[PDB]
Amino acid sequence: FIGNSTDYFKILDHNDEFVLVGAKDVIYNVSLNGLKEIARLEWHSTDADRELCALKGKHEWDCHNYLRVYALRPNGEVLLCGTNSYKPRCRHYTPRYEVSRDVEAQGLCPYSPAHNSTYAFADGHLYSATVADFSGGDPLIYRENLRTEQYDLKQLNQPDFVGAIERNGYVLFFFRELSMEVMNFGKAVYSRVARVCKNDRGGPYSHGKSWTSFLKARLNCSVGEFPFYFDEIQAISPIVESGSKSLIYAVFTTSVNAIPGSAVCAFNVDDILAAFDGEFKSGQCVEDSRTLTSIAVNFIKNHPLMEEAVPAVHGRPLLTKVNLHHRLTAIAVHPQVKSLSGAYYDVIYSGTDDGKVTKFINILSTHPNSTVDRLKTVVISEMQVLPLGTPIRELVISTSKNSLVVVSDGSLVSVPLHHCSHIVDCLGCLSLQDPICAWDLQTHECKNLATSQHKFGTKTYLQSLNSTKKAAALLCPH
Amino acid sequence: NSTITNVAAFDTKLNHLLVDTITGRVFVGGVNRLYQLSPDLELSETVKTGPQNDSVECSILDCPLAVRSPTDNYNKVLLIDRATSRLIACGSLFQGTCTVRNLQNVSIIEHEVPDAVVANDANSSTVAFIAPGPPQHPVTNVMYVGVTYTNNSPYRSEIPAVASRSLEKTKMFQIASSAVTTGTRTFINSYARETYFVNYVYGFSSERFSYFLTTQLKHSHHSSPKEYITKLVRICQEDSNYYSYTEIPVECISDAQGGTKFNLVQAGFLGKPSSDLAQSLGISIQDDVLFAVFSKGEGNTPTNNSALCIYSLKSIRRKFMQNIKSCFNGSGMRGLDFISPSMPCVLTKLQTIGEDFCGLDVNSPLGGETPITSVPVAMFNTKLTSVAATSTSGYTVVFVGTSDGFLKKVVIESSSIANEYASFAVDLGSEINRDMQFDNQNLYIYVMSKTKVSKVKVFDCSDYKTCGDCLGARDPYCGWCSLENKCSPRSNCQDDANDPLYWVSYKTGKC
Ligand SMILES: *[C@@H]1O[C@H](CO)[C@@H](O[C@@H]2O[C@H](CO)[C@@H](O[C@@H]3O[C@H](CO)[C@@H](O)[C@H](O[C@H]4O[C@H](CO)[C@@H](O)[C@H](O)[C@@H]4O)[C@@H]3O)[C@H](O)[C@H]2NC(C)=O)[C@H](O)[C@H]1NC(C)=O
Ligand SMILES: *[C@@H]1O[C@H](CO)[C@@H](O[C@@H]2O[C@H](CO)[C@@H](O[C@@H]3O[C@H](CO)[C@@H](O)[C@H](O)[C@@H]3O)[C@H](O)[C@H]2NC(C)=O)[C@H](O)[C@H]1NC(C)=O
Ligand SMILES: *[C@@H]1O[C@H](CO)[C@@H](O)[C@H](O)[C@H]1NC(C)=O
Ligand SMILES: *[C@@H]1O[C@H](CO)[C@@H](O)[C@H](O)[C@H]1NC(C)=O
Ligand SMILES: *[C@@H]1O[C@H](CO)[C@@H](O)[C@H](O)[C@H]1NC(C)=O
């Protein structure tokens, strides 16, 4: 599904059947069946509003109405907001559609089409994380009648938001920020997870317009005696239910003018919330936050940062790419793919800034070469999806259609989620090491175990994941 | 003494002084006290405002687990509303509370607000004047307030540094216009709030703009040594977002001892020029002139080395425009790093930035670096603490108060030529307050020291018996009629004499 390079696509909603794409002056409703346009809603900035934008020092390619917030309201109404040439507006479309409300959107919708902002429409309320000023120096996290402290750098210091998750009566915000936490900070960037209660109603008297529950914690995506940190978070995934554990997968990278490198980490949702229960660095949801004391609300506004850092699953990155030419930029996971032995493996898809998608799993071999358990990365495939230079912005998985939608700035491409049908050679089927593809010996076809039925006591199917890739091939006779 | 008419001695230390422009009644705000007087300094009413139980750690509603103790109530604001006859007085207690009292009888309280509005310190500045503003288009007046961060309570962060405040009965003393991301308000950021303090000296309104005369550190970061400068804070009065919040520095520079900078301003007064002075400045006689006294300071402490400097508001407006034009052309840094981190000025297609420029979203909180500069018309060996200017005579005479209690008169004939013609003590050993106001006819001037107020006559030509004494006094108010043996101004002589030398000035002729 191709458009110009000038527009800037942003997945604003995704189902297994349809996806909504906000672009330069329109929003598309696209079928995942064939990436075919199903519906369109055009909304162009008025010539006076976009002459005002170029007047204030912007270019032609900046002064457009980039659609960047979507939400279907519980009444059938449609909430739709756009940058409107650095003058963000929100509209209420009601049924096709017809305009029913138009109003300013400062603090509800970014000014710039950059992937700087995020939001979460949780329980009929929009939680927004963006800038509220044309100059981009007033970051905030805003809900109906509640915002963070304006220009308070201890709460937000030049942040770039990468995602927002709803969870258990909180709303989590994922972003990278400037470091003023350490007394000897020197323009360092650290990645945070923030939290606000959904039943927050502001503090008493003058605090009635500000959060009484904003807390943040640093994310730890480090590699031993010689630590190696990936401090700039780039993309997150939705919450993934891997068995009994809820996990969030994230892509991290090193800072500029540092050893270039990318990593993928995963954090348990329970570990994220547990960090907000430890010490503060020098939050519970009460039914009426307007009953708190001035002492308590002023405290949390002066200690919004937790002491402990959220640790990573397995205590290390699941994949690392250091000193390579490309950087990782997006993440998506197919959870709990049952292998031939009956083990469940999450299959991880991570796109690079030059249009590749890496597929891999992790195996936790218990005492294979030492007494401490050793985690290993099994890379299934690293193929080129987009043209050689184009950055992959997002990934959307459709486990139903066995399709992976790759999102660039001006296109959507779909590829197979699992390549079992494509391969026809025994060596290829075992060297692939996909937890879902296994080589049959009665039938010569490399088969997909989602539709097949093994029985644990039959030598029919053949699969090798723990070994090396050449060792999997030796299992093939002749 | 015959030059001093009435003297009123008060029991407490006095903080402020204003005169009703139509009734000439005198209002005096002091420590634990509040007085109303007649135009002849006869006491009408007196109000006990303190002491009361209060702690700086506590607000009115809550007192954290800290005890309230009897503390003095320093008067910080004294103002009159003309549309609705009512006096506004703000005290230091209870996080800086204002009361609204009746103008006929100050003992009557009409409205008591709990809002924290004013500095709760005894020495932290607070400047307040009433002028047109929002919410409505400029038919309603608002209160522009500027408060220093006293740094003694958590409740102090809530109070803005510069803000417009409503005078509506429904929304008394609330910020005039406020929205989600913007409003009639400027705060100092959490990182500079406790270290970068702002001293507000004088406030005034002129030609659709509100102004503040401030002393403050030139730089927020610690990369440079501490230098104190005088700044000028401006906001468009139509502006309900403070998009027009702008500052330029104010320099009063002298030739003496190589380079001499009088960096610390002590007092300000807005007034009109004379025929001769308006020609020098290149302004009309109806235009405004800012009179201010600057003192060279060792750090933040003013020394006994002051100077008198005048600024025309045509050159103030043209200097603001000069700093704004330059930013909107992309040159330099926006400034005001102590509000938010200073980002570069943006290049803009703006084609008609003039003197009335009222602000936009872009380059909004602008800190000018190009100062308005003036050479003082007079310098002094004492610390000057007040200033007032009248042009009842054909010449402008500037009244200057001393920290030692002296009153001096300077006559300003040009932007280059000025000199003292009178000097005498009003209250010896007692610093003259900054609030120094004239009578409605500009015939008497009210001089307030630590504990007294003195009604001083502006001129007295009758006490010059002979004529060499009349012209020798070099008083611009005094001439000498040829016929009658009286020293008196021109209007007092009768032009019935055939010779035009009937009334002669002190420099135009010889007696
Ligand atoms: C998130 O978790 C990871 C892993 O759990 C963690 O990485 C660990 O960091 C610590 C310190 O940053 C590393 O500890 C080092 O261990 C060696 C011994 O092998 C010590 O020598 C190190 O310094 C000590 O001794 C030095 C002797 O010269 C002294 O100079 C120094 O002052 C110290 O006394 C130090 O203890 C540890 O090896 C890594 N572990 C791994 C697996 O990488 C990371 O720090 C965590 N992040 C956050 C934000 O908490
Ligand atoms: C993108 O376009 C597709 C196709 O036009 C939209 O899907 C359609 O959505 C409507 C409205 O929800 C569905 O109608 C509803 O059907 C249910 C099921 O019977 C019924 O109970 C409701 O009363 C209503 O009639 C319609 O069936 C559905 N069509 C398909 C093929 O799925 C889709 O909603 C659009 N995207 C978004 C974000 O709305
Ligand atoms: C509070 O005021 C009372 C008068 O009602 C006074 O007796 C008391 O001493 C004050 N509190 C303190 C701690 O002094
Ligand atoms: C002024 O107010 C006080 C206090 O209410 C009252 O005692 C007095 O009688 C009033 N009028 C005059 C003329 O003093
Ligand atoms: C306030 O100023 C006066 C006069 O300068 C001084 O005597 C007093 O100690 C000061 N108070 C404080 C708390 O600095």
Numbering used by the authors:
A (entry chain B): 53 to 147, 165 to 292, 294 to 352, 374 to 569
B (entry chain A): 62 to 126, 128 to 573
Extract from the study:
Semaphorin ligands interact with plexin receptors to contribute to functions in the development of myriad tissues including neurite guidance and synaptic organisation within the nervous system. Cell‐attached semaphorins interact in trans with plexins on opposing cells, but also in cis on the same cell. We have discovered a distinct mode of interaction through which the Drosophila semaphorin Sema1b and mouse Sema6A mediate binding in cis to their cognate plexin receptors. Sema1a and Sema1b are most closely related to the mammalian class 6 semaphorins and interact with the sole Drosophila class A plexin, PlexA.
John Wiley & Sons, LtdIn the crystal of 2:2 complex, two pairs of 1:1 complexes are packed together in the asymmetric unit with a relative orientation of 168.8° to form a pseudo tetramer. Each Sema1b molecule binds to both PlexA molecules in the pseudo tetramer. There are therefore two independent interaction sites, A and B, involving two different Sema1b‐PlexA orientations. The first, head‐to‐head orientation is equivalent to that observed in the 1:1 complex (interaction site A). In the second interaction mode, termed side‐on, Sema1b1‐2 and PlexA1‐4 bind through the site B or B’ with their carboxy‐terminal PSI domains oriented in parallel. While the B interaction site is extensive, the B’ interaction site is formed through distant contacts between three residues only. The structure of individual Sema1b1‐2 and PlexA1‐4 molecules in the 2:2 complex is very similar to those observed in the 1:1 complex, showing no significant conformational changes with the exception of the Exβ1‐β2 loop in the extrusion of Sema1b1‐2, which adopts a different orientation in order to avoid steric clashes with PlexA1‐4. In the side‐on orientation, the sema domains of Sema1b1‐2 and PlexA1‐4 are bound in a configuration in which the bottom face of PlexA1‐4 is oriented perpendicularly to the side edge of Sema1b1‐2. The most prominent, site 1, is formed by the extrusion of Sema1b and blade 6 of PlexA. The Exβ1‐β2 and β4B‐β4C loops are involved in semaphorin homodimerisation; however, for Sema1b1‐2 in the 2:2 complex these loops mediate interaction with PlexA suggesting that a B‐type interaction can only be mediated by a monomeric semaphorin molecule.
